[PDB]
């Protein structure tokens, strides 16, 4: 767990009566977006979305643009095929999502590769962890499996995941080193708001942290609480960092029995916080 990942996320959406399907891709290293492409843009091109990628030459942007354009066309055929496999009408909108990439350890070695697909938000077919075989969700996906085996796609995906995917991720980690291999710890505080004259809300905050993975837990007398607690989804601040909070409703006068425990990669040691009344 000085580990890193590269992921690409492709979204193709049909829109009958409103043109051909839109294709969008984005690429990430860990929680940092670095590229996009949108087939609806005035002139569709792979575009940089982080400072460290801007140095890549015109050959990089041109090649990758060509790749997304080819993939957009092929997703359109996939979408037509999938509509037939499920005996669906021409009138409805459908989504084909793709997500793929590689995970590496501290040393740059491949830990795991991924290449999978969803249709209308439901798992459809996935390259297994072996990078040689597929898991299909239903009889429709079994047809896609048969086509993928005939074209020997798993072999080619294995070669991309073990090769280019890891070599490029290593390159990005070195070029964006100052941000991508920096953990920013959370800045924390606990607030207190009376609800009634017999209960109060304690809210434990974490701000300014990177990467997004964090755990915030409230204990009462040192036992984890999930009762009378609210925990919001980790959310982006817009300056690359993340935010999260967890709250618990407590009996007035019992605040000192409650502690907020914070774990993050940026922290040498987990924190234990309490509310401190001014």
């Amino acid at each position: 767990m000085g580990s890193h990942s590269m992921r690409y996320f492709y979204t193709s959406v049909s829109r009958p009566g409103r043109g051909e399907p839109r294709f969008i891709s984005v690429g990430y290293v860990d929680d940092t977006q670095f590229v996009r492409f949108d087939s609806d843009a005035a002139s569709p091109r792979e575009e940089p979305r982080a400072p460290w990628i801007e140095q890549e030459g015109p050959e990089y942007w041109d090649r990758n643009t060509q790749i997304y354009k080819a993939q957009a066309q092929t997703d359109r055929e996939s979408l037509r095929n999938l509509r037939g496999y499920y005996n669906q009408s021409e009138a409805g909108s459908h989504t084909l999502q793709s997500m793929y990439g590689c995970d590496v350890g501290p040393d740059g070695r491949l830990l795991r590769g991924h290449n999978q697909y969803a249709y209308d938000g439901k798992d459809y077919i996935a390259l297994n962890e072996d990078l040689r075989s597929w898991t299909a969700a239903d009889t429709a996906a079994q047809i896609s499996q048969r086509k993928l085996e005939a074209a020997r796609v798993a072999e080619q995906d294995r070669a991309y995941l073990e090769g280019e995917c890891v070599e490029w991720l290593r390159r990005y980690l070195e070029n964006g080193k100052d941000k991508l291999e920096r953990a920013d710890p959370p800045k924390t505080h606990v607030t207190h708001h009376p609800i009634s004259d017999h209960e109060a809300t304690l809210r434990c905050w974490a701000l300014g942290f990177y990467p997004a993975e964090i755990t915030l837990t409230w204990q009462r007398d040192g036992e984890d609480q999930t009762q009378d607690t609210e925990l919001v989804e980790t959310r982006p601040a817009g300056d690359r960092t993340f935010q999260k909070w967890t709250a618990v409703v407590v009996p007035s006068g019992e605040e000192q029995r409650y502690t907020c425990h914070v774990q993050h990669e940026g922290l040498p040691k987990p924190l234990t916080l309490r509310w401190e009344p001014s």
Binding site: G27, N64, I67, Q71, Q73, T74, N81, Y124, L148, A151
Partner: peptide, 9 residues
């Protein structure tokens, strides 16, 4: 860099 395959289902 993205995969240079254009895989159909």
């Amino acid at each position: 860099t993205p995969q240079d395959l254009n895989t159909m289902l």
